[PDB]
Design an enzyme around this catalytic site. Structure first.
Site, PDB file in Angstrom:
ATOM      1  CB  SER B 355      -0.903   0.010   1.236  1.00 41.58           C
ATOM      2  OG  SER B 355      -1.699   1.182   1.264  1.00 41.58           O
ATOM      3  NE  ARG B 356       4.224   6.258  -3.823  1.00 38.78           N
ATOM      4  CZ  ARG B 356       4.709   7.500  -3.808  1.00 38.78           C
ATOM      5  NH1 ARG B 356       4.130   8.462  -3.089  1.00 38.78           N
ATOM      6  NH2 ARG B 356       5.794   7.790  -4.524  1.00 38.78           N
TER       7      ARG B 356
END
Ligand SMILES: Nc1ncnc2c1ncn2[C@@H]1O[C@H](COP(=O)(O)OP(=O)(O)O)[C@@H](O)[C@H]1O
Ligand SMILES: Nc1ncnc2c1ncn2[C@@H]1O[C@H](COP(=O)(O)OP(=O)(O)O)[C@@H](O)[C@H]1O
Ligand SMILES: [Mg+2]
Lengths: 487, 524
Positions: B355-356
């Site tokens: 997840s960025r």
């Protein structure tokens, strides 16, 4: 009522199986069947299905028969709608082609009705809200990879593993347990293989000439042009749809082979002038399978349950033709040659198999828990089989020896003598009930049948037949032992 | 739709595409507009304009009643872009990309062709979005307005994890203010028809239809609808976004949308490139997913969270459609086939997944526990005859806890993870973690036997959920009270409940133990 009924047209252009037709009073609709009335130099008739429209007065078609001897400006007349195929119980026992003409030389069919080949797939409201188990009466299937109502089922297996035998047993067992009929779509099949199915069904009496028949045959073979081989899958599906919707019944469909549907459409799509997608298939590959496979489903009215053969070209499973099909399928049945040659029939390798409805929500909790333990025990057994080859049978632990004794019995008990295969096995068939299958396997996992010998479980159906064979083995072993306790 | 002027006649059809000849006068329809073809005197058939040729001819993409379309039929124009029904009244219903409602067994409109929010219109993602999975919500946390991809093979749990994320919202949405309710939009592109029915029943049984609307373009329906289905899905979400409310959008799946768009492009002789897809197949998914966003305080602060699903063939991320969608989305949730068959369900490959905008998305309480779990599982994966460290013991229990069918509630998840973090499941064996977790949530051992005496903190009181989200577990209010609950639960479970495992060496009891433990995997 029926407009455009006998609307006359003339053949504008003929390039292979693809034929253009000019109509004076406007073109008919799409998918409309057209009989070529002209000429008697041909030995068989010619029927064209409109696929595309070029202008208001011209329409491009595909030929179901060969386009030999077809002159330009030849008279062509509409049928009324789509290609129409006969349905109902009068079809049972008879062989058909893509169009619905009888190809078995046994007089005219009794047909009280005809339905169109290109039906629409059911809406959301028509779908079943109960994922339901279709009890095949076979131990390996019902326990480990149960076929569901409405299900697309896939039969993976090489040449001479038990495919035609299993289809014939399902045609029997549908008719025993649910009283259902069967339909066989010979899609792009060998014409000579079609004879052997017709004879073997006549010998086993699923098809009967003098009496009651419980099978329909619809064949579009390799000799036929691509237009027929493409549409012949839908012809069989229309007959099964009648038994589903109108008669309200559980029905089986048998498509050998579903790749040949996709491949047949790949030929016409080339001739139509469409640009090919990945790996030279038609751009409508996913859509072609979509409209076909979606019609095969469990409605509120009945349930069609299609078992299918799928050719994987060049053993490349990433190829579009199988890869696209995999999303549609429910129960993957894998048949192995080494399992067949070892003695276990049917030759179902249960580890490579799988089913969507193998789930605590759909089937009962007792079904899932017992079925998982068979899969778990067989997985442990394959690991232990590598240890015995290296070390030895005596080297294993006390508990692991008992797992081998049970697991060896599980492999043997998974075998079953088929009712259609009485000639082969030389023993009467066994329809094993779902309640019998779950209880007998449950007790074997508990260890209630540890004292029962191993060969008692080989080629029988249900616990009563196991204990019957074990009684016969105890009596015959007592006699042969008494003979050597003397000489 | 609203007819206006008779623009032309139908000339050619080629499956789901057609071209028109203009009527006398040459009125000329506007670009990208809907047009109604009169299939009969009573019925019409919709279609979208894609080409306006110099000749006067007009290229059409057919949508409805494709079998009923014929050459020589009259064609009426709307003179408007595709608008569809959107609002609260559309919820709990199944709908086409064109807007027609689908029957199931027993509202101001909005433009589908819309530009995404610009640079100053958006803001950083702060509001969390709970999938209801301990694996996801800790390691790969999704924020509201984020685009989180779901990738993996067929039958790896891509739909289930997306559908259960929608079902997880009902428990919150029922209790909370409707301003912060996550309204869901499940788009079903190219799927089988019975699969949509089973999801409808599954959404209905968990009360999800109240807070959900189902976009549907099944495999029977044409490529024109499949192409346009995700666009119609976002349009319905943008209503909630632009009116200061938070929304969720599942596209299941973009792989089948691309195949539908490829069919359209190839049939109209558009030059194909990699894997026979057109030049603008990247642009197809890019303008879709960018419309999903987290708006600024200046424009309501609403959101559309995107969960695009993309099927991979034999764990091959190098495919053109898969690599395109990865480069657009804010990280992914990879579902491995070997983990699925191995036991772990959902089969979330934590090493491959990412997840960025994870840290900023999480809750203050969830950020506390999850920061440590990354350190433990990193050392556990590296260290994985035997030899067991504290990380090896506690790491293995996390893996057992991540297995779940239906989604966990935020309180029931974080407490069972907090127990494993501080080491309350060390003496408890790996096979009895789900039985330990079940007896924590539904039952309670302190109140059972005798040794309770907690003033407020219990597991039956579900309302503590929102107090935990405010203050966290590591806090002077709840720390001492929580560590009592867990100490009572462990000591009694080890003494009274785990003592049976040394006993029970018979056939009707080992099987009874199994059937108990199997059912414990499902209920968290
Ligand atoms: N249930 C069964 N019992 C006994 N023999 C079987 C069974 N199934 C298949 N066989 C044997 O396997 C052979 C090949 O099976 P078959 O289904 O005819 O292959 P194919 O589908 O390639 O024609 C048969 O000759 C038959 O003797
Ligand atoms: N967390 C889970 N636990 C147990 N079974 C699951 C879970 N997620 C999915 N499944 C099951 O796995 C099968 C495939 O799931 P699905 O989401 O349909 O995968 P895909 O979207 O790749 O087809 C379904 O039968 C479903 O019930
Ligand atoms: Mg899916």
């Amino acid at each position: 009522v029926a407009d455009h009924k006998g609307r006359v047209g003339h053949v504008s252009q003929v390039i292979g199986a693809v034929v253009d037709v000019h109509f004076a009073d406007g073109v008919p609709p799409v998918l409309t069947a057209l009989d070529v009335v002209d000429k008697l130099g041909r030995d068989e008739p010619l029927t064209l299905e409109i696929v595309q429209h070029l202008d208001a007065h011209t329409g491009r078609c595909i030929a179901m028969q060969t386009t030999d001897l077809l002159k330009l400006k030849a008279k062509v007349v509409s049928t009324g709608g789509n290609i129409s195929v006969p349905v109902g119980r009068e079809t049972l026992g008879r062989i058909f082609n893509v169009l619905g003409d009888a190809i078995d030389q046994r007089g005219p069919v009794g047909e009280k009705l005809r339905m169109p080949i290109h039906a629409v797939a059911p809406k959301l409201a028509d779908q079943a809200a109960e994922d339901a188990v279709l009890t095949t009466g076979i131990k390996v299937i019902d326990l480990i990879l149960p076929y569901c109502k409405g299900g697309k089922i896939g039969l993976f297996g090489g040449a001479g593993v038990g495919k035609t035998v299993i289809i014939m047993e399902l045609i029997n067992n549908v008719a025993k347990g649910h009283g259902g009929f069967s339909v066989f779509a010979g899609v792009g099949e060998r014409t000579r293989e079609g004879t052997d199915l017709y004879l073997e069904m006549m010998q086993s009496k699923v098809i009967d000439l003098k009496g009651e028949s419980k099978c329909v045959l619809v064949y579009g073979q390799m000799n036929e042009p691509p237009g027929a081989r493409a549409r012949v899958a839908q012809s069989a599906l229309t007959m099964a749809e009648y038994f589903r919707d109108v008669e309200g019944q559980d029905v089986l469909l048998f498509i050998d082979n579903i790749f040949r549907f996709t491949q047949a459409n790949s030929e016409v799509s080339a001739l139509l002038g469409r640009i090919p997608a990945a790996v030279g298939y038609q751009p409508t590959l996913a859509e072609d399978l979509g409209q076909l496979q979606e019609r095969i489903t469990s409605t509120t009215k009945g349930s069609i349950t299609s078992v299918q053969a799928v050719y994987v070209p060049a053993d490349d499973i990433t190829d579009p033709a199988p890869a696209t099909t995999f999303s549609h399928l429910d129960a993957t049945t894998v048949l192995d040659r080494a399992v067949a040659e070892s003695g276990i029939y049917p030759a179902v390798n249960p580890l490579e198999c799988a089913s969507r409805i193998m789930d605590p929500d759909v089937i009962s909790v007792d079904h899932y828990n017992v079925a998982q333990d068979v899969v778990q025990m067989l997985t442990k057994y394959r690991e232990l089989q590598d240890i015995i080859a290296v070390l030895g049978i005596d080297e294993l632990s006390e508990e692991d020896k008992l797992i081998v004794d049970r697991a060896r019995k599980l492999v043997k008990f998974l075998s079953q003598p088929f009712q259609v295969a009485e000639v082969f096995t030389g023993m009467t068939g066994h329809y094993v009930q779902l309640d019998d299958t779950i209880d007998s396997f449950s007790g074997l996992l508990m260890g209630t049948y540890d004292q029962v010998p191993e060969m008692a479980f080989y080629m029988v159906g249900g616990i009563n037949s196991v204990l019957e064979k074990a009684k016969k083995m105890a009596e015959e072993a007592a006699e042969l032992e008494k003979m050597r306790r003397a000489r | 739709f609203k007819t206006t002027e008779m623009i032309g006649y139908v000339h050619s059809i080629d499956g789901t595409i057609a071209t028109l000849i203009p009527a006398p006068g040459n009125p000329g329809v506007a670009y990208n507009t809907i047009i109604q073809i009169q299939v009969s005197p009573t019925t019409f058939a919709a279609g979208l304009v894609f080409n306006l040729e110099k000749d006067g001819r007009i290229g059409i993409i057919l949508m409805d009643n494709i079998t009923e379309v014929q050459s020589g039929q009259k064609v009426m124009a709307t003179g408007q872009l595709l608008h569809i029904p959107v609002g609260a009244g559309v919820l709990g219903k199944v709908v086409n990309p064109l807007g027609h409602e689908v029957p199931v067994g027993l509202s101001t409109l909005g433009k589908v062709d819309t530009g995404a929010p610009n640079i100053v219109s958006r803001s950083p993602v702060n509001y969390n979005l709970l999938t209801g999975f301990k694996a996801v919500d800790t390691m790969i946390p999704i924020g509201r307005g984020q685009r989180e991809l779901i990738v993996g093979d067929r039958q790896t749990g891509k739909t289930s994890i997306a559908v259960s994320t929608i079902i997880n919202q009902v428990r919150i949405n029922q209790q909370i203010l409707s301003k912060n309710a996550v309204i869901s939009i499940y788009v079903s592109i190219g799927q089988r028809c019975s699969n949509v029915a089973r999801i409808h029943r599954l959404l209905q049984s968990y009360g999800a239809l109240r807070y959900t609307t189902v976009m549907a373009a099944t495999a029977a329906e044409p490529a024109g609808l499949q192409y346009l289905a995700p666009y119609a899905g976002v349009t319905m979400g943008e209503y909630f976004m632009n009116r200061g409310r938070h929304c969720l959008c599942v596209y299941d799946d973009l792989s089948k949308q691309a195949v539908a768009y490829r069919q359209i492009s190839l049939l109209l002789r558009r030059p194909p490139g990699r894997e026979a897809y057109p030049g603008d197949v990247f642009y197809l998914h890019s303008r879709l997913l960018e419309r999903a966003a987290m708006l600024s305080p200046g424009k309501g602060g609403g959101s559309v969270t995107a969960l695009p699903i993309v099927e991979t063939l034999s764990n091959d991320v190098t495919a053109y459609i898969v690599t395109n969608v990865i480069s657009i989305t804010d990280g992914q949730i990879y579902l491995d086939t070997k983990l699925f068959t191995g036991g772990q369900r959902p089969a979330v490959n934590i090493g491959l997944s990412v997840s960025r905008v994870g840290s900023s998305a999480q809750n203050a309480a969830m950020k506390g526990v999850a920061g440590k779990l990354k350190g433990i599982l990193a050392e556990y994966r590296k260290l994985a005859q035997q030899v067991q460290t504290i990380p090896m013991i506690r790491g293995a229990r996390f893996v057992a806890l991540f297995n779940q069918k239906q989604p966990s509630y935020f309180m029931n998840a974080i407490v069972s993870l907090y127990a494993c973090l501080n080491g309350y499941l060390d003496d408890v064996k790996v096979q009895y973690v789900k039985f330990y977790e079940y007896l924590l949530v539904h039952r309670d051992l302190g109140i059972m036997y005798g040794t309770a005496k907690n003033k407020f903190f219990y597991m039956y009181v579900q309302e503590l959920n929102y107090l935990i989200r405010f203050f966290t577990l590591n806090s002077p209010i709840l720390h001492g009270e929580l560590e009592e609950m867990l100490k009572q639960h462990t000591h009694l479970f080890l003494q009274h409940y785990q003592s049976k495992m040394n006993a029970i060496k018979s056939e009707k009891d080992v099987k009874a133990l199994k059937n108990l433990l199997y059912s414990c995997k499902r209920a968290v």
